[PDB]
Amino acid sequence: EKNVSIVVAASVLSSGIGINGQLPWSISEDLKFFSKITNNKCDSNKKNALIMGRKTWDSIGRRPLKNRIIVVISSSLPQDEADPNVVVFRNLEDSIENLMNDDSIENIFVCGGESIYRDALKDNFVDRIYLTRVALEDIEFDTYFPEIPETFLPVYMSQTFCTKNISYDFMIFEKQEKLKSIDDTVDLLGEIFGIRKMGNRHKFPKEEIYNTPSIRFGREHYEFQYLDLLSRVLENGAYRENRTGISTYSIFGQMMRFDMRESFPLLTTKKVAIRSIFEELIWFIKGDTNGNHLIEKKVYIWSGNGSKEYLERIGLGHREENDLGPIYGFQWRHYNGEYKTMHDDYTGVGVDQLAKLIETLKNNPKDRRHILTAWNPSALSQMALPPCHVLSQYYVTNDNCLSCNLYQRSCDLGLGSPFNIASYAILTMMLAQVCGYEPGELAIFIGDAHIYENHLTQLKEQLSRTPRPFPQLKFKRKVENIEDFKWEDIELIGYYPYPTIKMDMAV
Amino acid sequence: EKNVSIVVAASVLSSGIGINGQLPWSISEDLKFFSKITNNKCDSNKKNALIMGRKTWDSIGRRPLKNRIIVVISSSLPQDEADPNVVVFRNLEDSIENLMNDDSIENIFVCGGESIYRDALKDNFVDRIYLTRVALEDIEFDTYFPEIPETFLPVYMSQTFCTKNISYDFMIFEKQELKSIDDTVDLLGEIFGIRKMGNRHKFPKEEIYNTPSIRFGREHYEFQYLDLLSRVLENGAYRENRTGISTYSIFGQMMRFDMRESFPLLTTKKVAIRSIFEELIWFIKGDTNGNHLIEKKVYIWSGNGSKEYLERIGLGHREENDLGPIYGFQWRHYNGEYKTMHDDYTGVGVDQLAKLIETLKNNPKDRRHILTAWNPSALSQMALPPCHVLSQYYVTNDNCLSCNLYQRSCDLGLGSPFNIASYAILTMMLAQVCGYEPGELAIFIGDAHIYENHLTQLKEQLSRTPRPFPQLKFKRKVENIEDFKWEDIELIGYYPYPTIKMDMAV
Numbered sequence A: 001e002k003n004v005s006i007v008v009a010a011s012v013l014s015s016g017i018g019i020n021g022q023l024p025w026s027i028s029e030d031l032k033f034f035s036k037i038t039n040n041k042c043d044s045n046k047k048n049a050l051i052m053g054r055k056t057w058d059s060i061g062r063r064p065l066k067n068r069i070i071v072v073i074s075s076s077l078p079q080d081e082a083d084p085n086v087v088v089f090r091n092l093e094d095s096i097e098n099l100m101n102d103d104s105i106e107n108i109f110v111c112g113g114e115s116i117y118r119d120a121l122k123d124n125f126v127d128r129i130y131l132t133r134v135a136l137e138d139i140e141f142d143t144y145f146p147e148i149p150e151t152f153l154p155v156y157m158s159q160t161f162c163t164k165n166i167s168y169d170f171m172i173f174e175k176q177e178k179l180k181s182i183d184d185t186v187d188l189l190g191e192i193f194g195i196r197k198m199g200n201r202h203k204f205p206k207e208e209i210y211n212t213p214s215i216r217f218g219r220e221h222y223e224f225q226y227l228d229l230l231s232r233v234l235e236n237g238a239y240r241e242n243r244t245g246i247s248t249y250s251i252f253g254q255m256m257r258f259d260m261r262e263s264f265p266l267l268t269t270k271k272v273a274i275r276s277i278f279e280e281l282i283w284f285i286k287g288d289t290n291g292n293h294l295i296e297k298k299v300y301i302w303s304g305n306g307s308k309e310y311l312e313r314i315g316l317g318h319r320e321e322n323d324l325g326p327i328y329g330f331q332w333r334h335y336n337g338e339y340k341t342m343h344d345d346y347t348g349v350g351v352d353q354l355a356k357l358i359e360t361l362k363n364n365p366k367d368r369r370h371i372l373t374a375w376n377p378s379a380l381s382q383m384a385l386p387p388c389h390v391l392s393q394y395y396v397t398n399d400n401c402l403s404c405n406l407y408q409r410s411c412d413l414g415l416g417s418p419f420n421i422a423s424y425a426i427l428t429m430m431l432a433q434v435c436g437y438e439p440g441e442l443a444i445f446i447g448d449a450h451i452y453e454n455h456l457t458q459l460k461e462q463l464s465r466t467p468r469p470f471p472q473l474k475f476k477r478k479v480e481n482i483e484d485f486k487w488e489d490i491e492l493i494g495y496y497p498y499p500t501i502k503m504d505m506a507v
Numbered sequence B: 001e002k003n004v005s006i007v008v009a010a011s012v013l014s015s016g017i018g019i020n021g022q023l024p025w026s027i028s029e030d031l032k033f034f035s036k037i038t039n040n041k042c043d044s045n046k047k048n049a050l051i052m053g054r055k056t057w058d059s060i061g062r063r064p065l066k067n068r069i070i071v072v073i074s075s076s077l078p079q080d081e082a083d084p085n086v087v088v089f090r091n092l093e094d095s096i097e098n099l100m101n102d103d104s105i106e107n108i109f110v111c112g113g114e115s116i117y118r119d120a121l122k123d124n125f126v127d128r129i130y131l132t133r134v135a136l137e138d139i140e141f142d143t144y145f146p147e148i149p150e151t152f153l154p155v156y157m158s159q160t161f162c163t164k165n166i167s168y169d170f171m172i173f174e175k176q177e178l179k180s181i182d183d184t185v186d187l188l189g190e191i192f193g194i195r196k197m198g199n200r201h202k203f204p205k206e207e208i209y210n211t212p213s214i215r216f217g218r219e220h221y222e223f224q225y226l227d228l229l230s231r232v233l234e235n236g237a238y239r240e241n242r243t244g245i246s247t248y249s250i251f252g253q254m255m256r257f258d259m260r261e262s263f264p265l266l267t268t269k270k271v272a273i274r275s276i277f278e279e280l281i282w283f284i285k286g287d288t289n290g291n292h293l294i295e296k297k298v299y300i301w302s303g304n305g306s307k308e309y310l311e312r313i314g315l316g317h318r319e320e321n322d323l324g325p326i327y328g329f330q331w332r333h334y335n336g337e338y339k340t341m342h343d344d345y346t347g348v349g350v351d352q353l354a355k356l357i358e359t360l361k362n363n364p365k366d367r368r369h370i371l372t373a374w375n376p377s378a379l380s381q382m383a384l385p386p387c388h389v390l391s392q393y394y395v396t397n398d399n400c401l402s403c404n405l406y407q408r409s410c411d412l413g414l415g416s417p418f419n420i421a422s423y424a425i426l427t428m429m430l431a432q433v434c435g436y437e438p439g440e441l442a443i444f445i446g447d448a449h450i451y452e453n454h455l456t457q458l459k460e461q462l463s464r465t466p467r468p469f470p471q472l473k474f475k476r477k478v479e480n481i482e483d484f485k486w487e488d489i490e491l492i493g494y495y496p497y498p499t500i501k502m503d504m505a506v
Ligand SMILES: NC(=O)C1=CN([C@@H]2O[C@H](COP(=O)(O)OP(=O)(O)OC[C@H]3O[C@@H](n4cnc5c(N)ncnc54)[C@H](OP(=O)(O)O)[C@@H]3O)[C@@H](O)[C@H]2O)C=CC1
Pocket: A007, A008, A009, A010, A016, A017, A018, A019, A020, A021, A022, A023, A052, A053, A054, A055, A056, A057, A059, A073, A074, A075, A076, A077, A090, A091, A092, A111, A112, A113, A114, A115, A116, A117, A119, A143
């Protein structure tokens, strides 16, 4: 008995693997993965066997692979014994003569197109699947990878990588069949001390609220940094009241990291309105607090906090309909500026923090003070809503990459959080291009991480969806000033999300 | 064959376990731990055997323990067969008749004082040690727990618990004698070099990992700081800064601390707790006069407040130690027109700390309890921009006050141990004035760095296995938060390692 694994690279939705006798793409890093995963062995005096079909054998030029024995399944190829690195069998069952015989073969790999993939799964020969999901779906396929049967469970999902603006990840599927004393001692201490033991205040989420719970040790995909935060809130969130009529389940002190070098952290478990995120971000940068400029561009996310009824409730009945007051983008461009109304001209007033940030980022990159704040206690009472994303710090690595850290005092995990993840990712990328750097990492530190109680059935639905590789975000042109970005200048490549989920905002 | 474990509660330094035929302390949670750890079994038709010496058998009243069979080692006690829950053997060697025979016993526990402990380790009978370190050392002991032999390695260290202002933790010692996922991740790390984010956050090597045998049981929250040191030494990029001393820096790190059952004061190094407090009360009082700290023998702000340093950053018009509007001037007089350190600022600016205290008790579930120090209109007037920039506070449902701090730049050698204790005390002060209890402390860090002249020092600190945190209690209740004094603070059970000298980069 030995191991039999499948190596395959299929598209993310339709699981396409080929077209016209060749691959639908050209990803060199994926081929290197095929090389290292099929050459990985222990016994130096043994080799691995790679089973493939005839049409696949033709697609690789009918030439052997170094240090590996290729097994071709064909009904016509002559069983020539001249080449010891290439052997031909008449059927897939007989080809698996390496389990009970031929001790020179250590591991077995299946990689031979739809015919061999489907027959290897139907006849129950495969123990493990190495899947490379490619984010390409509006192209033509003629051979597909069969749907993974229910007997397999995912145990690993890598981060999203990029090659020629093509997103792809790497997954491992295992076939289900059926320290030791440290966990017991911790459980006993949790019975003695109830809430006195901090571990009992941060309980690990139950399987029923854990997204794809079979992936236990391989939660590398950074969308899990958000999905696992939802699970931790559903498990430990305290039922609390707030200024709105809608209570939340809240915990305090959480973080989540995202990579921006090889992907863009736009959630795939739900179709996120990327256009509204951008139009809000450019709305901040331009220094604008007029809420009508977003409604004029069909962006209604700031309508609730800018109605005549809401403004009179918080004591701002003297303002216009959508006069949100000095908020994000007024502390960015005119910090400590005497705010009047949304119609006045504030050019030159206040401290232009964003400009000083951009100028400092290229003139002194290793400076430890690249900070953009929005918490002005002298102007909180004039704001329609105090800042949620309060403070952000920026950092230039040695390889000329721009990372970003954000502190968020209050995080609506249902609506605001997916917006804040993408918004500050775009902002860092904008700052990276204007300063001549590359995107780095994104860390978001959260204070009051909460779920509104009317989002429970929606967020539980979102947790039932296994994530997909992140898309790519590229800029079409180089701008001279950061205020010059437009929505047409943004290209979103390879975004194949799950259907959108409607959730109401608590005003 | 079955398992043989030792259960013991010894003091933190001298490993004392008894005095005059009784325990040196009275910790009820420790007895429950002994109860649950000796009753833990699988087979319902089997019992666990507790081996003890005669003097220990007398100390527990010579009465049996429920659901367990007690084995007494004595040379005089009669081998009475009347009680089946109490059996007597003449020596510890003969007593181990439960391993290869007598299948009714599942697990074996040794817990019988110094005489049995020392012979159980000398004759090499013990597979595991359950140690309860108690932070009591200036009392009298007469029986000690023998030094743990080198064949045992720690595999678990719990958080610090508190009982009657007594700190104690729980450790597990073991005697040294997925599958395909780790390989696939390594291969991806060879294909993509620094393109894979995992390679930018490499796990620290064993040579720089504090107590590396504790792999799955790093519960003690001092590891939240020691492991941050390890991550910097592994991935820190050599970078220059405004000082002449370069650092190894990483970006985006955090560490949590408990304040309910302990106080996060580092034990791997004797931290100057008095200087931390006098600086914190100096902030609360709204003071920027750097002489008031030197008058109280606190020299931490001397480097950033000298005539030479102030002229260099363009503040030569200030007095010697006039640090300018810094911490405690943005707390009490935010956006206030700063003049000098001698002027009267009563009533000017926005008093954030006062508004914070009033909001914490009048509206605890409010999500806006924020105390900021980053004022871009006054950065040029400051002798040093704020490192601990923003802090947020949170009132739990059980009336506990937690704290979140964002720190833009963190000197892990000097500033970090100060910032951990400083914001812990501040949260406790806010908790008493508002009528709550201390909760949790989370510190989010931007530029977490180590100065290159701290390398041999911090590597020395990583060689020390941590000890349970001390306790911090206030002797009296104050009416206003500014009224705290150093005499009002009682530090209980602080037994740290010797201090480590490190120079500050000006
Ligand atoms: N993305 C990826 O990971 C991979 C993609 N591909 C792509 O898939 C395409 C090729 O795959 P595909 O079209 O399905 O053809 P196959 O690679 O599956 O090969 C099929 C051939 O194998 C022989 N064969 C298959 N089944 C049997 C059987 N039950 N008994 C005897 N002989 C059998 C036959 O050869 P004969 O004519 O001699 O009878 C048959 O024509 C290409 O585009 C290729 O690039 C291929 C491998 C991997």
